[PDB]
């Protein structure tokens, strides 16, 4: 296999609508469902938004996760594996608050058989995974207003570190007139960035920790 110079999973219909997590630290759950959504499309041909709320409510203390106070994409995947399913967004809609677990196997929209973690800081391996496996869940350092106020172009933040805090989804990569980037789906609604997306600097020494903790699920 030869790696393409650019990849965009939106062009294979493997990426759902941008979501808005609202005033709730559930980025981890959106990142996890976004990665699984792509695998579901590849597996079944169906593009279905999966329930971030299912994860907030049900993948809890046993998985190190704390609902609107943060969690882990990797252990979200493990909950879906353990639970033998996750509900669709439409059946278990998102409320930007912690709720009682309400999973109902009757509305299961996807399963998960395994997940894979990529080596820390390896943007070459991240590129390979995005090209050959699908969108990849990642953490980034987003605790800078420059991130919240991003509008267009390739984002580069000299104040960034590799200590990541915010879960997002890499759905592609490319370059903008030679400025290489990662195409990142955020969960701050469509008014964020470029229609909900941010293009973050690529091959700039693991900029903002984008390749610090990548993972992706399979079905």
């Amino acid at each position: 296999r030869i790696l393409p110079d650019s990849v965009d999973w939106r062009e294979k219909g493997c990426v759902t609508e941008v979501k808005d997590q609202g005033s709730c630290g559930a980025c981890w759950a959106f990142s996890a469902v976004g990665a699984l959504e792509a695998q579901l499309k590849l597996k079944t041909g169906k593009l279905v938004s999966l329930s971030a709320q299912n994860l907030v409510d049900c993948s809890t203390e046993k998985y190190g996760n704390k609902g609107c106070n943060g969690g882990f994409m990797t252990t979200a995947f493990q909950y879906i594996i353990d639970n033998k399913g996750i509900d669709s967004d439409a059946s278990y809609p998102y409320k930007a608050m912690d709720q009682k677990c309400q999973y109902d196997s009757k509305y299961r929209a996807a399963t998960c058989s395994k997940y894979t973690e990529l080596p820390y800081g390896r943007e070459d391996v991240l590129k390979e995974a995005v090209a050959n496996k699908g969108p990849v869940s990642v953490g980034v350092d987003a605790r800078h207003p420059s991130f919240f106020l991003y509008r267009s172009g390739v984002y580069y933040e000299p104040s960034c570190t590799q200590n990541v805090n915010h879960g997002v989804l890499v759905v592609g990569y490319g370059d903008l007139n030679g400025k290489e980037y990662w195409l990142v789906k955020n969960s701050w609604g469509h008014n964020f960035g470029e229609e909900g997306y941010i293009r973050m600097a690529r091959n700039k020494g693991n900029h903002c920790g984008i390749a610090s903790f990548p993972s992706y699920p399979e079905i």
């Binding site: 981890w28 190190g64 106070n69 882990f72 200590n163 990541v164």
Partner: peptide, 8 residues
């Protein structure tokens, strides 16, 4: 080394 996705 992975931290929750704490300072939200």
């Amino acid at each position: 080394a992975k931290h929750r996705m704490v300072m939200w």
